[PDB]
């Protein structure tokens with residue numbers, strides 16, 4: 001899939017993409033509901049993080065899968081955006097729960113229709 005990380009229309013291009021289409025992206029992509037439950041999780045993310053994309057669907061990202069992101073700097077920004085109904089933030093972060101610390105760039109952006117939210121990830 002020919003889509004770049006951080007592109008200004010990314011929510012339109014990814015919108016309603018099925019699981020197989022998402023696996024073709026060059027960067028990690030997760031779709032969360034407003035509570036942080038995982039709706040979609042692509043192959044590129046599983047390769048970065050080691051998690052199995054099939055097993056994490058339905059788990060809570062902030063409680064279960066990613067406690068290192070349960071902080072003001074990640075989860076706090078997510079819940080603020082869910083509450084306001086808009087979200088578009090990009091920052092660097094370190095994942096250090098199930099592996100050696102790994103630095104990434106994260107882009108969280110509200111998905112175009114409904115009340116769903118994207119978390120995009122690439123290595124830095």
Ligand SMILES: *C(=O)/C=C/c1ccc(O)cc1
Pocket residue numbers: 030045049051065066067068069095096097098
């Ligand atoms: C810290 O606990 C981060 C964990 C994590 C980040 C991203 C993922 O896709 C899965 C786990």
